[PDB]
C-alpha cells in the first residue's frame, strides 16, 4: 500500500531524506552525476531537501487497512475502492487528534490479522 500511495521521486517533497544525500554529493549512483544536470534539476533537489513539505500519510494508511480486508475476504475485491471512500469520509469528517492516533493502530493490528 506504499506501492500505491508513495511516489518514486520528488513532486511534492516526498523522499526528502534521500534528497539531502544528493546535495551532500555522497550518493551511491555517483556524486558526479548530480553536478551534470540543468539549472532546474539542482534548484529543486536543494529546495526540497532543505525545507521538507511532506504529504499526509492518510492515503497510505487507509489503503493499508482496506488492502488487509481483501486478504481476509471480509469485503469483496470490488469494494476495495468503495470503502476507500468510506474511510476517507469517516475519519475525515470526524477527525481529531485521537482519531489520527487510532488510525495508526490499524496499520499493525489489521496487517497481522491477515
Amino acid at each position: 500500500a506504499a506501492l500505491q500511495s508513495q511516489p518514486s521521486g520528488i513532486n511534492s517533497s516526498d523522499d526528502w531524506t534521500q534528497a539531502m544525500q544528493r546535495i551532500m554529493a555522497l550518493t551511491t549512483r555517483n556524486p558526479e552525476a548530480f553536478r551534470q544536470q540543468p539549472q532546474a534539476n539542482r534548484l529543486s533537489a536543494i529546495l526540497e531537501a532543505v525545507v521538507p513539505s511532506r504529504s499526509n500519510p492518510t492515503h497510505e494508511k487507509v489503503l493499508a487497512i482496506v488492502n488487509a480486508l481483501v486478504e481476509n475476504k471480509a469485503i469483496r475485491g470490488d469494494e476495495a475502492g468503495l470503502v476507500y471512500n468510506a474511510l476517507l469520509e469517516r475519519v475525515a469528517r470526524y477527525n481529531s487528534t485521537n482519531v489520527q492516533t487510532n488510525l495508526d493502530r490499524m496499520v499493525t493490528d489489521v496487517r497481522e490479522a491477515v
Binding site: E79, L82, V83, N85, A86, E89
Partner: protein
C-alpha cells in the same frame, strides 16, 4: 339471428396502488433491498425521471 361482434376487455383495480419494488428480482425479502445497499457504503447521487 346473432349479429357480427367484436370483443372488448378491460379490468378494474380499486383500493390498491400499483407497485414496482426496487429489487433485482422484483420481490421483497428484506425491507432494505439489494439495490438500496448499493449507495449504502458511500453516497452516490442521480436524477430519477419517470
Amino acid at each position: 339471428s346473432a349479429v357480427t361482434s367484436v370483443t372488448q376487455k378491460k379490468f378494474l383495480c380499486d383500493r390498491v396502488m400499483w407497485r414496482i419494488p426496487f429489487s433485482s428480482n422484483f420481490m421483497s425479502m428484506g425491507a432494505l433491498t439489494d439495490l438500496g445497499q448499493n449507495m449504502l457504503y458511500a453516497n452516490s447521487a442521480h436524477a430519477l425521471d419517470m
